[PDB]
Amino acid sequence: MCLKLNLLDHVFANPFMNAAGVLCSTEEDLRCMTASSSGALVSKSCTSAPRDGNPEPRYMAFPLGSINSMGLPNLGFDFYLKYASDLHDYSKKPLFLSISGLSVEENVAMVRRLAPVAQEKGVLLELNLSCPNVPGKPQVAYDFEAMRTYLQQVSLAYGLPFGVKMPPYFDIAHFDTAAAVLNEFPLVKFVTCVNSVGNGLVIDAESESVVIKPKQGFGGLGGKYILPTALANVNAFYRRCPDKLVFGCGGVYSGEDAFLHILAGASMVQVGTALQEEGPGIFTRLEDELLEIMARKGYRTLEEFRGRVKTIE
Amino acid sequence: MCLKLNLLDHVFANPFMNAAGVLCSTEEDLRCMTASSSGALVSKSCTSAPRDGNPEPRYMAFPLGSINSMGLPNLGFDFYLKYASDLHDYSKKPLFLSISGLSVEENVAMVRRLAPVAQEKGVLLELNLSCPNVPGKPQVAYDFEAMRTYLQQVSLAYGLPFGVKMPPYFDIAHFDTAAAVLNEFPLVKFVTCVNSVGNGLVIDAESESVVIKPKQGFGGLGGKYILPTALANVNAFYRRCPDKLVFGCGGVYSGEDAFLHILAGASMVQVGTALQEEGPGIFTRLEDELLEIMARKGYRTLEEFRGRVKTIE
Ligand SMILES: Cc1cc2nc3c(=O)[nH]c(=O)nc-3n(C[C@H](O)[C@H](O)[C@H](O)COP(=O)(O)O)c2cc1C
Ligand SMILES: Cc1cc2nc3c(=O)[nH]c(=O)nc-3n(C[C@H](O)[C@H](O)[C@H](O)COP(=O)(O)O)c2cc1C
Ligand SMILES: COC(=O)c1ccc(CCCCc2c(C(=O)O)[nH]c(=O)[nH]c2=O)cc1
Ligand SMILES: COC(=O)c1ccc(CCCCc2c(C(=O)O)[nH]c(=O)[nH]c2=O)cc1
Ligand SMILES: C[As](C)(=O)[O-]
Ligand SMILES: C[As](C)(=O)[O-]
């Protein structure tokens, strides 16, 4: 049994990939992800200029998950574009580039430059609809009229199929609104649910201290903490966006967790915290575990159960 | 060494109490909570009329926490008012009464009738704002205009100090806006952070099914999943509402978890999922555990560390 699959006019050996920001910032990291058994990779979200990001410590992990306030450290867009255009071996697996400009204009400028590389090489865009704190203003995907604007301007500037990285929502009216926004854009062909659960706070009892330096310890949560949140977002968007793909991200440590994401609707399954903690060897384990659950159940393909979570009545 | 607190013109033996909805629906439940070692109790959120709530199964628990869509089952306001007015033994501990009307008028009608019993008997109101208003709109506390309306109307109708049960927020701009709304209302004397993390989805891998019946499996999350979210919300409101008390709720299973809440700013500490799972014996364990951490650290009272979480630099 193999798990190869066909999305966005690309072929994938399996549905696994890193989550943006994990093992993907440097050329070393991208080559390591390309050498792994993952089905695809995605670059660190980028800005027009290089950034050092926030002061350390800015990531910590724990048995139930991680917290981070990285601050968008990256090598800058020119580097990731060069990686895409000149360095990546597309014979090995597909590449996604994540962009997270600090304004709409910065994102439009990056997308106009990516477009011909996308056409020439097939690199795929993941637009990160997360943002820095601006007092008096929520992140873009939490401001639905702002989100509609970004997406209008990117669609126009880019002109090619792309995807969007979403934060979690917690309210069914918000699912309805967000998905309606996304469905106004036919070039949005995948939706990645979810980014980290925003602005949690981990405290060390012995030291009586927060554990990350930025933002008085507040940071985004990943890992075990967030799996039901992630599943809920995957399935909410799966149900609301039938003409799009949904990529699942959040809380995947095992092939069973990936199974759950696929049952909820996921096409690709992205691995953040667990990959950060275990390293790239995780991909062979995930694939073996997923194939074992499939075999036990009699499933021969991912399509047999994608989106097929059962409700009661 | 001492767990006593004196706040809101009451004396509490210790900071622990049930979270609303857990072990508090029936007279039997309320008598059980009263007979426990908890420092206080709160009643099930009520409506004007009795409700059967949602179809079962509607609550499930797992190693990392719980999911529920109970649908507000309760015996109705008159019952809880009678319990406050005639049945509760206030010499044992303080009582809070939670109200969760399905419109602002229903809340007004309840608090006008509660007011005299509050004044005579000293029952304390906790107004649930994580609660539907118009379907297709967000819950009340995710709609800042609705929230302001609810608070203006309840403040006028009730005329006495009360508190509010808040959902978690995930964006700094929402912390800022929410707290600013609360700080418009001087009668809001305590803020309970947090209600369950909304619209999670737990899926059973073996059965391939969601585990609760209502809402196609979507429900609010409690327990280990939500502790860093809870701590963040306690701390954020602690910092932003210096003239109010913050009560902590979410992910408390141990004295250590409680100590973390208290470091974050909690006065009272509410126990939901863990109490549902363990039963009321949990309160003696929590008290002993908290006192053991205080002894190791040399703390003699709760005020010596409440709000004293350290940040880096
Ligand atoms: C250290 C770190 C850095 C991240 N950087 C980014 C980023 O650059 N872009 C992004 O879209 N998400 C970023 N994320 C979010 C992850 O892609 C992912 O959405 C989140 O961690 C949840 O998945 P998990 O439970 O597997 O960790 C980052 C996460 C971590 C832990
Ligand atoms: C079965 C159940 C019923 C609940 N009912 C209510 C309620 O009536 N009113 C309310 O404010 N919160 C209610 N909640 C939320 C809890 O009060 C609490 O905010 C949440 O469970 C998080 O705390 P925990 O992590 O200790 O479970 C309920 C939670 C559970 C599990
Ligand atoms: C808080 O300090 C800041 O300057 C700052 C904080 C956050 C940002 C935006 C981060 C977007 C990239 C990202 C990161 C990250 O780089 O911090 N972490 C995540 O969990 N998800 C993400 O999408 C930009 C600046
Ligand atoms: C989902 O179907 C319904 O009919 C319905 C669902 C929910 C409500 C509001 C519930 C408020 C009480 C409450 C409950 C609850 O009783 O379901 N559960 C929580 O975790 N926190 C709460 O604050 C009212 C009706
Ligand atoms: C593996 As690294 C510090 O470039 O994310
Ligand atoms: C997946 As079967 C063949 O057990 O319904």
Classify residue B262 by burial, with Cβ atoms within 10 Å: 0-12, 13-18, 19+.
buried
Per-residue HEC secondary structure of chain B comes to CCCCEEECCEEECCCEEECCCCCCCCHHHHHHHHHCCCCEEECCCECCCCECCCCCCCEEEECCEEEECCCCCECCHHHHHHHHHHHCCCCCCCEEEEECCCCHHHHHHHHHHHHHHHHHHCCEEEEECCCCCCECECCHHHCHHHHHHHHHHHHHHHCCCEEEEECCCCCHHHHHHHHHHHCCCCCEEEEEECCCEEEEECEECCCCEECCCHHHHEEEEECHHHHHHHHHHHHHHHHHCCCCEEEEECCCCCHHHHHHHHHHCCCCEEECHHHHHHCCCHHHHHHHHHHHHHHHHCCCCHHHCCCCCECCC
Report how far residue A199's alpha carbon sits from residue A218's, in angstroms, rounded to the nearest whole number. Answer: 5
Q: Could you tell me if the CB of B220 is within 6 A of ligand 4?
A: yes
Cβ–Cβ below 8 Å for B228 and A293? no
Report how far residue A276's alpha carbon sits from residue A175's, in angstroms, rounded to the nearest whole number. Answer: 29
Report how far residue A30's alpha carbon sits from residue A28's, in angstroms, rounded to the nearest whole number. Answer: 6
Same-domain status, A1 and A142: yes
For chain A, how many residues are written? 313
Closest-CA residue of A relative to B256 is A205
Looking only at the bridges linking them, the beta strands covering B95-99 and B65-68 are unpaired
**Residues in CB range of B3: below 8 A, 6 or more apart:** B13, B14, B15, B39, B287, B290, B291, B302
Q: Which residues pair with B270 in a beta bridge?
A: B17, B249
Mutate to test the pocket of ligand 3, among A69, A216, A229 (most ligand atoms within 8 A of CB): A69
Tell me the residue type at A34: T
Report how far residue A174's alpha carbon sits from residue A141's, in angstroms, rounded to the nearest whole number. Answer: 10
Same-domain status, A23 and A65: no
Tell me the residue type at B257: D
Query: Of A133, A193, A194, A203, which to mutate for an interface test with B (greatest number of B Cβ within 10 Å)?
Result: A203
Report how far residue B52's alpha carbon sits from residue B69's, in angstroms, rounded to the nearest whole number. Answer: 12
Residue A197: which of B209, B229, B293 has the nearest Cβ?
B229
Report how far residue A38's alpha carbon sits from residue A10's, in angstroms, rounded to the nearest whole number. Answer: 14
Give the distance from residue A6's alpha carbon to the nearest chain B alpha carbon, in angstroms: 24
Tell me the residue type at B136: G
- Chain A residues whose CB is inside 8 A of the B172 CB are 133, 135, 199, 215, 218
Domain boundary among A222, A237, A272: A222
Measured by CA distance, the residue closest to atom 4 of ligand 4 is B71
Tokens representing A84 are 């895409």
Distance between Cα A220 and ligand 3 center (Å): 9
- Chain B residues whose CB is inside 8 A of the A310 CB are 207-210
Report how far residue A70's alpha carbon sits from residue A195's, in angstroms, rounded to the nearest whole number. Answer: 13
CA dihedral of residues B152, B153, B159, B162 (deg, nearest 10): -70
Residue that is written with structure tokens 């418009």 in the block: B184
Tell me the residue type at A159: G
- Chain B residues whose CB is inside 8 A of the A169 CB are 199
Tell me the residue type at A312: I
Closest CA to A15 of A196, A264, A232, A239: A264
Cβ–Cβ below 8 Å for B136 and A209? no
Q: Could you tell me if the CB of B101 is within 6 A of ligand 2?
A: no
Tokens representing B200 are 């999670």
Cβ–Cβ below 8 Å for A209 and B312? yes
- Chain B residues whose CB is inside 8 A of the A218 CB are 172, 232, 235-236
Whether the CB-CB separation of A197 and A225 falls below 8 Å is answered with yes
Distance between Cα A189 and ligand 5 center (Å): 29
Same-domain status, B147 and B164: yes
Whether the CB-CB separation of B162 and B150 falls below 8 Å is answered with no
Same-domain status, B128 and B232: yes
How many CB atoms are closer than 10 A to CB B3?
Answer: 17
Same-domain status, A155 and A216: no
Of all helices (H) and strands (E), which one includes residue A216? none
Among all bound ligands, the one having the nearest atom to the CA of A32 is 5
Residue that is written with structure tokens 């902590």 in the block: B248
Same-domain status, B212 and B280: no
Same-domain status, B213 and B94: no
Same-domain status, B120 and B212: no
Tokens representing B247 are 């009560």
Is B21 labelled a binding residue? no
Classify residue B136 by burial, with Cβ atoms within 10 Å: 0-12, 13-18, 19+.
exposed
Report how far residue B108's alpha carbon sits from residue B153's, in angstroms, rounded to the nearest whole number. Answer: 7
Asked if A32 is an active-site residue, the reply is no
Residue A199: which of B57, B170, B199 has the nearest Cβ?
B170
Same-domain status, A92 and A62: no
Report how far residue B229's alpha carbon sits from residue A203's, in angstroms, rounded to the nearest whole number. Answer: 11
**Coil, helix or strand for A197?**
strand
Query: Of A131, A311, A313, which to mutate for an interface test with B (greatest number of B Cβ within 10 Å)?
Result: A311
Report how far residue B265's alpha carbon sits from residue B249's, in angstroms, rounded to the nearest whole number. Answer: 11
Is A301 labelled a binding residue? no
Same-domain status, A139 and A202: no
Q: Which residues pair with B192 in a beta bridge?
A: B165, B247
Closest CA to B80 of B100, B104, B108, B105: B100
Cβ–Cβ below 8 Å for A139 and B236? no
Residue B190 CA neighbour count, 13 Å, CB half: 26
Phi/psi of residue B30, nearest 5 degrees: -65, -40
Same-domain status, A218 and A79: no
CATH number at residue A217: 2.30.26.10
* Domain hosting residue A3, numbered range: 1-53+72-196+223-313
Measured by CA distance, the residue closest to atom 10 of ligand 2 is B20
Same-domain status, A67 and A10: no
Method for this entry: X-ray
Of all helices (H) and strands (E), which one includes residue A90? none
Residue that is written with structure tokens 């629906």 in the block: B25
Tell me the residue type at B193: C
Closest CA to B97 of B12, B28, B37, B40: B40
The number of angstroms, rounded, from the C-alpha of B168 to the middle of its chain's C-alpha atoms is 12
Whether the CB-CB separation of A217 and B312 falls below 8 Å is answered with yes
Is A251 labelled a binding residue? yes
Tokens representing A18 are 């890193």
Domain boundary among A222, A239, A262: A222
Residue B235: which of A201, A205, A256 has the nearest Cβ?
A201
For chain B, what is the domain count? 2
- Chain A residues whose CB is inside 8 A of the B207 CB are 310
The sign of the dihedral angle between the CA atoms of A134, A137, A141, A142 is positive
Tokens representing B258 are 């409680």
CATH number at residue A121: 3.20.20.70
Q: Could you tell me if the CB of B270 is within 6 A of ligand 4?
A: no
